[PDB]
Amino acid sequence: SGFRKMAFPSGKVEGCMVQVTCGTTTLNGLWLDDVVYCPRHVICTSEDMLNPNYEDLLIRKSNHNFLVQAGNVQLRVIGHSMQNCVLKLKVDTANPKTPKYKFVRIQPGQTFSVLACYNGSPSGVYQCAMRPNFTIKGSFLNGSAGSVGFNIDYDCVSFCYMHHMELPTGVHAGTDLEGNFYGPFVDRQTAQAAGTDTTITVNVLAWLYAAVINGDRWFLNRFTTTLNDFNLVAMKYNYEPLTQDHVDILGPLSAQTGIAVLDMCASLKELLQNGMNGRTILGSALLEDEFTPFDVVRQCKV
Amino acid sequence: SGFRKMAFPSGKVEGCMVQVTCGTTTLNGLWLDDVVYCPRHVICTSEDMLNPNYEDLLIRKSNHNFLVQAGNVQLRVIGHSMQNCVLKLKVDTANPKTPKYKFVRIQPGQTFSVLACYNGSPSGVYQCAMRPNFTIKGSFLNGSAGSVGFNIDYDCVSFCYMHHMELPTGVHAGTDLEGNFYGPFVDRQTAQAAGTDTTITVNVLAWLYAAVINGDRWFLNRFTTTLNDFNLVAMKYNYEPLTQDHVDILGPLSAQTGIAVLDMCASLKELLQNGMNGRTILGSALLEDEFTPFDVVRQCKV
């Protein structure tokens, strides 16, 4: 037993990280088959981040202006093309370590692992969620751009995030591997800011089921609620609405614990309105919302 | 910006995990060079749980009774030995993925990355601290014994933990890689209890520094303290003693923030005597003690 924020094993992604350098600017790239993906802001210099004309910057670059190193193996670039807000650098050598993979765009509320990398070298792996306001609360220093987020299912890597930038409140914004940003953000210096964030209700319910599975059940009670009475309280506490589809998705955990979803909602309602009164749930004094139902099922097994 | 529980990249350790089966019992082993290390209770049957005599159980086993599979490769056991609570199975092939490595016995309060594995297949990675009472709070189900904990420094994997068992309170116990158990525990299914745990003071101070680096400053104040006076307060709250060597190890974080270590001690003292008044620090409503000073510098150093 036990329940922990767990990331996926990072080995399959580690062998895909490379360093991309354009002039004096270096960040990380993702080397799959004979293509290296990286944020397009690598082609800027200090006099360019204000209003970059990315189309014109890239045309004026030649293939020999991109220095791609996979460890100490130099990869020769033989084509460069725009992919929305990332670059696809074609190289002459296929990555021998390319895993089975797909590119997937994740929904707010879904989790993934992040391999934080600097200078093409992995530093750490951690788990995090795509927030409802399309940011992630990551841990990233300067040079982390091009670090990727991913899920792994039966040795297939589903890449879902590439890191681009830090917003003024310290949260992080980035794209999918098709180069489209999550949320309204742009890869320019603007006054852009994260919108107000909310709590991921279905995940908090999943985590309370995990707590029940782990023998932590002081917050269960005899009350039940309707879905709508729950959602009115949830709104008041800046929680996302719970849909019928979320209730259905919580079906497997409801069956395993014998606790109906709307009874757990009654528990959550009481926790929102009265607090924990000094108690903890799974070691936490706050309600945790970065575990999905799938994360609980995979970690708690049967 | 941002602060997350961050594990080391797991690739180097993933290539060392194998499956060891004896009869109906399966768990994980660690394959380095031509030796597989695994918990000795793989040789246990139903009648052996309360007081196994492991000398007897091992003599009743031949090299052929041990099935080792690395991926889809059967490894031939050509030798078997018991050292303390682990078994060393000599196999006929050296692991080609053996990383540069060492075996180390970690000290209480130190942290490590755990690669949780079932059937020889890594499932997840997460951070754990060796508690002062020599347990860890992990996430381990049946079949996870032989999962390892490790740190990585300059491509060298320092193995510090092999998982063996779960105590009745739901916390975890295991050995170093020479098979010596952390704490007074024994690998048998008896009523065992850990001592009351204490809080790892140097790590709380490290995390307060992480909070300051990330913009939380509300708990700072002008009071300072002696090391001696603070340690009287720590003793009163079941906090570990702070040594002068802890103070030295916090110096890089005092340097980056401008807060003298004994001033941070004064802040911690006020936090313990008053609580947080519903405020949070780095997102938590509790003081967190599972980050070492090195852990904070790894994520925060400019």
Residue numbers in the entry:
A (entry chain A), B (entry chain B): 1 to 302
Tell me, in the authors' exact words, what the paper reports:
The main protease of SARS-CoV-2 (Mpro, also referred to as 3-chymotrypsin-like protease or 3CLpro) is responsible for the majority of nsp processing, cleaving at 11 conserved sites along the polyprotein including self-excision of Mpro by autolytic cleavage of its own N-terminal and C-terminal autoprocessing sites. SARS-CoV-2 Mpro is a functional homodimer of two symmetrically disposed protomers that are each 306 residues in length (33.8 kDa). The active site of Mpro features a Cys145-His41 catalytic dyad, which orchestrates nucleophilic attack at the carbonyl carbon of the invariant P1 glutamine and the formation of an acyl enzyme intermediate central to efficient peptide cleavage. Using C-terminally substituted Mpro chimeras, we have determined X-ray crystallographic structures of Mpro in complex with 10 of its 11 viral cleavage sites, bound at full occupancy intermolecularly in trans, within the active site of either the native enzyme and/or a catalytic mutant (C145A).
Cleavage site C8 has crystallized with the same approximate unit cell dimensions and relative Mpro dimer orientation in the crystal lattice as that of the earlier structure for C5; however, the C8 crystallographic data is defined by the space group P212121 with four protomer molecules in the asymmetric unit (ASU) compared to space group C2 and two molecules for C5. C4, C6 (form 1 - see below for definition) and C12 also share a general relative disposition of Mpro dimers in the crystal packing but C4 and C6 have higher symmetry belonging to space group P22121 with three molecules in the ASU with the symmetry generated dimer contributing its C-terminus to one of the active sites of the non-crystallographic dimer. By far the most conserved residue at the P2 position though, in both viral and recently identified mammalian cleavage sites, is leucine, present in all of our collective of structures with the exception of C5 (phenylalanine) and C6 (valine). P2 valine, unique to cleavage site C6, also maintains a highly analogous set of interactions with a markedly similar S2 pocket, but with a less optimal vdW interaction surface as a result of the gap from the static pocket edge to the shorter beta-branched side chain of the P2(Val) C6 variant. Gln189 is more extended and forms a single hydrogen bond between side chain Oε1 and main chain NH of P2(Leu), an interaction common to all Leu/Val P2 substrates.
